[PDB]
Design a protein around this nucleic acid. Sequence first.
RNA 1: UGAGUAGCGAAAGAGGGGUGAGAAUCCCCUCCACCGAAUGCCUAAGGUUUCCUGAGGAAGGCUCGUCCGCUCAGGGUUAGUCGGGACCUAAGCCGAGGCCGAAAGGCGUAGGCGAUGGACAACAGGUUGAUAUUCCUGUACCACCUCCUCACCAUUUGAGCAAUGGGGGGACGCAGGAGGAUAGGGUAAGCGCGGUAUUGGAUAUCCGCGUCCAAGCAGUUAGGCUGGGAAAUAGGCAAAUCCGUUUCCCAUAAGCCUGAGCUGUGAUGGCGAGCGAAAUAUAGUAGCGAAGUUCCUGAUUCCACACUGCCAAGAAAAGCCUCUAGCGAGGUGAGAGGUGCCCGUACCGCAAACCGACACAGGUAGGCGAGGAGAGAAUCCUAAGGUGAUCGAGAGAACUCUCGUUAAGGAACUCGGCAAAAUGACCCCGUAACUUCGGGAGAAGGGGUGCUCUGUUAGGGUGCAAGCCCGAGAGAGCCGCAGUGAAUAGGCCCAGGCGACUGUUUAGCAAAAACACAGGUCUCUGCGAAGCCGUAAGGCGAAGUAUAGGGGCUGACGCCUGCCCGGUG
Lengths: 44, 93, 275, 24
Amino acid sequence: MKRTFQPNNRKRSKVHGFRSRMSSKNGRLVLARRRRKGRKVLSA
Amino acid sequence: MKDPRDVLKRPVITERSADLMTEKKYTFEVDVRANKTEVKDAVESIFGVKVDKVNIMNYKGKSKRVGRYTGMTSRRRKAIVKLTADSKEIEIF
Amino acid sequence: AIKKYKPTSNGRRGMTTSDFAEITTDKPEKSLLAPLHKKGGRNNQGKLTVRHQGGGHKRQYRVIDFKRDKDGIPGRVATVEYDPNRSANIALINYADGEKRYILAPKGIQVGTEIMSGPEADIKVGNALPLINIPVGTVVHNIELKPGKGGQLVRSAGTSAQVLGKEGKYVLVRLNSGEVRMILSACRASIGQVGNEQHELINIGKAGRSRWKGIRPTVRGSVMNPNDHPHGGGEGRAPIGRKSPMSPWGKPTLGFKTRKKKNKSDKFIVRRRKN
Amino acid sequence: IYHRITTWIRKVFRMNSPVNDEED
RNA sequence: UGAGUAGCGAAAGAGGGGUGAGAAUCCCCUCCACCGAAUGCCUAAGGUUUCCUGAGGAAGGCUCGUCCGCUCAGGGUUAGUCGGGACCUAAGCCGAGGCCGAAAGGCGUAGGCGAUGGACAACAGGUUGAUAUUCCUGUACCACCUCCUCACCAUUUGAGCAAUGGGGGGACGCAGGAGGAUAGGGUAAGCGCGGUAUUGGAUAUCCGCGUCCAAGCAGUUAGGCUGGGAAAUAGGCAAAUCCGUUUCCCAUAAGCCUGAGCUGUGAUGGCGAGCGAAAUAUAGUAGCGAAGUUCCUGAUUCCACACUGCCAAGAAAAGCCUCUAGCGAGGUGAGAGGUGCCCGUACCGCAAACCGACACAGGUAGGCGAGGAGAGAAUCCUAAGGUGAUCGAGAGAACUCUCGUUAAGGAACUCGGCAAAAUGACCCCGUAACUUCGGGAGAAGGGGUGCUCUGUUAGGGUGCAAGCCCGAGAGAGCCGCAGUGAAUAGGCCCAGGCGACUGUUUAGCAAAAACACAGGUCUCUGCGAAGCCGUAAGGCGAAGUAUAGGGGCUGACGCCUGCCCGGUG
């Protein structure tokens, strides 16, 4: 049966990309939380 | 800069490449940002040989784990320049 | 005319379609075609402000200058064409300029008949001349509210209007269903009621034709869950026990006036609600 | 040869139908 | 601990050898089995090397293991023509100034982004342990540029280039039916084979092969132009010998535009059944190489949304075709010389290389998809191509499951004909109540279809003939329990309640007497709308206009739909 994960790189990039978060201040906050914790891999 | 001479890296020594030596073509690694037009001006300067149809290829690096620590190989970009007939090789020499 | 279908199938038992006798050419002129993206009734925000819209057949707009701003220039009715966008049929008219403009079509028009858009034009059907020159009591269609704005009034098929008389300011008019307004005397209008009166008589006859309209089905309110609709809840076909029949929005619908008691148009309302 | 080896374990879940009936 | 107990993940393997310390599981050979409208290939998504060669093998292989999609070493994707970007535009999004909003931001022009679309030039064989409409051998094609080679012209009396502008064209729905031709199958001919020891065939015997493209050139299936010529123009922001419009001339086709696919050229080239060396690092190639016709059969493909019919009337722009505005001193018309970039190219994609914790009985566009019977991408058996689908051995207990059978009976079982059985394939006979006259209706109920001959039938398809095919109707005969013999392709007759119907609904307990629908009715709404989504701006309704929209109620159709305004709105 069909499952929730049906990958598409264009979708993952447009929705969860670094500039998708740069597009709004809230996403900048997401990046800020991403960087304060020292994550090796920001965004998607 | 820019200069033709710095564009090249090292020759590709493979059994597949040695067969191409009779094809009047010689593989060479080339900078990733370099274009085919730049490579054509390199052989004409460095080797002095007339250039015909140049082919260029890029390779994604393979994983090369060392114990716990995995790591991607650097992306090589060899080029294939098909030299014109009647032209001495400088390779190996 | 109306072509009744033999009940070869359950959907044939009631369905009917108009004769399409007025139609002459199968295809529209390319020059005046315009795109019509279907909003589906959604807001620009993306939310659906209007219930049960979209899903209909694709449509392509034909340019129509209701304003008829040009004047003194005779025209000619070359062709008549079907209009998916509205019940009224479209009739193409060739101007003496060589200009071409699709125009609203009153019934009884003939192919090749002359039509002048000017004030000096004859009463004869298809002409559009200012209200001051219009004789009292003649039928009029495509009336503008203000000059240069286009005729929002009486665009649908089979509708009509009549003049009760006129002053310098403003000319009286009988709007459909008997309502009356003092429309501006300077304002332009077109004599002769719109054709395709038989459209009201048309029977859809099946759920499938409605999809092409495309009129999406509407759930009855009592069937709806109480959280979604005021008349919801109950143990099977709940009685409209709650006081005052209601829309899903809080305003009552049966007999409740939705009019703003204060409005700029209120002065113009000489008459209202004849029922 | 390093011969490194790694093992991973996960709890997962879940069902709860629960298929239980009565008393009512 | 339960236990050495459950499980070992659908569905054929057997033998001979080989490798090796170790072989049921690895490799090779010979049989056999399964898919074959795929368990076949080709290519997206996605995975990101899992591909290849040489080794290793402790762990990951529901088991061993010399073997792996494992672990190590190197090796492997080649493009002006394929896909995408140096072209365009849709939904949608971003969005200078701007319109709004405590702030943050929201909205929206110009403009830009964005294919799932439009535009666009390369086709045939060969090659490796791989990657090939990329490398190679042939023939080509598009665009751009002149140290060049000829041909034609003109110096503002202007040869030509001709737009960001105006038109033309691109440019589009569904269904159906003739037609032309082809990708594909089969027959007679042709060429290479074999005389077969199991009774009998140099014989209406047997096996195998039966050709080839984009293009540059010619014309043809045929469709579309509705006509072309002249004059006049309140128009297509300015202009136009362009378009549109108007008026005359000639209209039975001169002319105008596009064609599939054919014949010869592309090819004195290569594919090809079969021979198959030296030997090399003994795989098996190099290398040699015949015939290459004709008829029947043909679409779901193409000409092409071309034609006809229909309603629910069915994208957008650029590339192009022209027109002037505007640029001008050297340009055009053909040959030669060169230039042509940036990314994706491996493998797995019906799957053990992905969605699923797994090497998981499920899930995953689309493009090719054969033969015999058959209406057929039904069904059964088989080509092309794959698959031996990775725990087994043997006893033949209960018991559980998947099935096959059944003496005499039948639904006596049971909440309930649940399940199962039976019917079902074509042709023909025949067909009721009721009804909205369409139906009901494969009503029901019966008969005939296997094989042989008269019969290369009667009659049709194509063909000059010759031949290949589509094929009843019958008569006479032969057989078996049997005859669409296998396999899959309805069980009906009634009587009532509810619901017009198709359709939809709780994915993962309930699909329905529920929902919805057309219809019927009430009410509201006059455009700066009633209703809304929003603080607003904006937008939906609506490129709508009371025969149009919003909301409530009722549910096709037929007969109807009574009384009450005190109370509550």
